[PDB]
């Protein structure tokens, strides 16, 4: 919900699924025991779902391998090269 | 006291004492989520020991 | 639908699969957002 806040109105992952867990939602209130079994089923298959969607979101649609690589790059000195040279050419600023 | 036995479930008592202690290493052993915990016959589905 | 007929019974499946507010929205918004 925070993110489509501010991402363009993108549905649910779930998306007309949500009512379908709201129908079943809605049968274990028909349910005249309350069964914990079932209802973490349901939540697991929602869960799974969203996790699923989350993912391909996270890794292709907004690129954590990008990100990962620069921090390597530049947090973790993954351009080891590029920050010894940079180093080189600094020390003289940064050794103050 | 030697006296706790059941009497009625001395026959079966260590039966009953090995079952319980299977399903008390199952559900103490972190098992991986088994598939063999069946969404189908519930425990509460099942028929309770009563 | 809502509260309309009698025997029908959908009209407020939304209803109680949905809180009001949230029922609410999802009813108004939506064809809100197309005429916006």
Known sequence: ENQNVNLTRKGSILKNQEDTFAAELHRLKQQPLF????????????????????WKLMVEESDLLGQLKIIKDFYLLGRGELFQAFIDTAQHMLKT | RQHTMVSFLKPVLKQIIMAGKSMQLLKNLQCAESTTCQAGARDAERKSLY | PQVQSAADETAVQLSELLTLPVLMKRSITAPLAAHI
């Open chain 1, 35 to 54: 069964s914990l079994v079932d209802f973490e089923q349901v939540v697991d298959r929602i869960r799974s779902t969203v996790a699923e969607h989350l």
